[PDB]
Amino acid sequence: EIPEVLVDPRSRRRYVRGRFLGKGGFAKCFEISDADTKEVFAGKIVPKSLLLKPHQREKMSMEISIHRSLAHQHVVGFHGFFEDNDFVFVVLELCRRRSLLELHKRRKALTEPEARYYLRQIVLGCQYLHRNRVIHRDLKLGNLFLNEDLEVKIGDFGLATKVEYDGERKKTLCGTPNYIAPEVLSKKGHSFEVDVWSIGCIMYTLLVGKPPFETSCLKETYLRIKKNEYSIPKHINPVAASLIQKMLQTDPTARPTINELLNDEFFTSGYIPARLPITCLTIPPRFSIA
Amino acid sequence: EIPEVLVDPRSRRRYVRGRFLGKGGFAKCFEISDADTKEVFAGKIVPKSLLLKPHQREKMSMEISIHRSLAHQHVVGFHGFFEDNDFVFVVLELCRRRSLLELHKRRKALTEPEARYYLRQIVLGCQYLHRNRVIHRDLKLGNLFLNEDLEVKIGDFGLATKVEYDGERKKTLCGTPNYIAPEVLSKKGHSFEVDVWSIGCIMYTLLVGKPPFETSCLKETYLRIKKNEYSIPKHINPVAASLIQKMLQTDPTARPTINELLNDEFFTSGYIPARLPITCLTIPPRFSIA
Ligand SMILES: COc1ccc(N2CCN(C)CC2)cc1Nc1ncc2c(n1)-c1c(c(C(N)=O)nn1C)CC2
Ligand SMILES: COc1ccc(N2CCN(C)CC2)cc1Nc1ncc2c(n1)-c1c(c(C(N)=O)nn1C)CC2
Ligand SMILES: [Zn+2]
Ligand SMILES: [Zn+2]
8 A cells, every 4th residue: 555656745755665675663664766856765654554542653753753853974864754644754864785783694793893883883873862862772783774885873763762851760661672771671760871781782792793682582581681691702802891791780870871982992992994895794804904 | 374174183183164253472263163073163273484483382382281281161171282284273162252351342341240250250260270280371351251151261371381389480471461460560470369460450340341550551551550550430339349459469478369269258248140141241131030
């Protein structure tokens, strides 16, 4: 039923529906191109048949509200939204090189200078989110998207929440995040630190080549998270291992804040490439001097 | 792809696939009749394409293991299982009058003598489960099935667990039960009392005409459960209200045990019909003297 050609009344714009990208929760994403300027975008498309209950509607509406007000080099740009009688359409910045998840499935453990590259941009985008009082709450490999230059763009605000006043503890999270912080599981009240915890797990995954708390049962995984039950393999450099630990702590007060992170010895005393080549999508880069 | 005719090698038996009954988790259920004796059954059918990961397989296998060893008037009888290359087939006692859920959607609040009728048989089946060291963990309206005589049959052992030694606390529940006990949410360790809590909520629903902890967000609901945040409308007889409360308590040590329940004043000092007519599926029964 999804129409071949997405029409916005009000802006007059038409978009040809194109290549399927990926799917998740209520949504499906396609490559879409503006029929006029020919400019290309990603279209997030939610069927209204799945948004019959007000609570689901309010989630969709919250996603757009939060995403709508955000512009930054390392967050998937918002270029508009509109609806017809059957679907909601969200027009986003296309990231032609998919996400970190697909990079991770191909390359496993990344070289240390790569992790610094990506981690930095992840932190940068998240620094922007936090100073604008936004909590992502689902940072994971598949939500961190890569444009043609391999620049990271934080995406998917479907679990995001706006902090409303100082010291606010959000007490519910309605969704199931991948790298979910211990204080969400125990329902102890949560805020910005959930994102640092997640960047903890992303750092672990990028360097180690697998998630820190994987088992065959989500609930066993959850048990592990609560009891800080992980371990870093011995080959990981102590400085890296040390940043991972700082971030992966049970007590949210004790983790660095998003602004403390780029100042960490992991970044300041290691090499951080200015840019990565396309080869590095499939070949471990050596970073040779010539 | 589900075959029209289910063949067990080993027992030689064939079953014609018939009317669709309902669906849930990995399974679909149909009316099936033995091609030979013509006897009629319910067939629970799980596609192997959904059981690729060992963890899902072990759940299916656990369901059959637990259900297999159970025979009682008020638990859906197990009549066998078998598989081909694409499906698992479980052959169960057909309950022609669906479940309490469909009764509840039609009649809302039940008359007090009806609730006693149903609650008693629910408790009886569960008394059998508990003395055989089985915990259902998902007792709800849609799992309590009615045969042609309106007799209750506890069904769906997909979240059931065998208690293995005295004082064992099960620490994970991998599934999302409807009327989930507070000590499962807080991950405090859980055992048999989870079922009494559930019968608490079933009693509430049968008498009040809606669930005790309903909101528009499952997580808000969860918050309510943990904080014992419910209330009984004022028209509910104090003796009933009193049994509901005894069972709906945050502290699992403090709830009656399944064996304490039929001894409760709610049952012993009220009228309990020996049987209910089919009319009572759609008409409130007055229980007139002639
Ligand atoms: C060629 O362009 C792409 C190809 C593959 C992928 N995926 C990345 C994540 N993955 C799990 C599936 C593939 C992404 C892009 N580009 C791409 N560009 C922009 C967006 C998306 N994908 C996208 C969005 C979401 C969301 N949850 O809001 N899901 N996808 C898929 C954010 C907007
Ligand atoms: C005519 O026979 C029936 C018609 C409707 C229903 N349903 C009751 C629950 N509901 C939510 C859907 C309809 C049930 C029956 N009879 C019926 N009889 C026996 C069984 C089932 N249904 C059945 C089983 C399960 C399970 N989870 O293991 N799901 N269903 C559906 C247990 C075996
Ligand atoms: Zn599990
Ligand atoms: Zn919700």
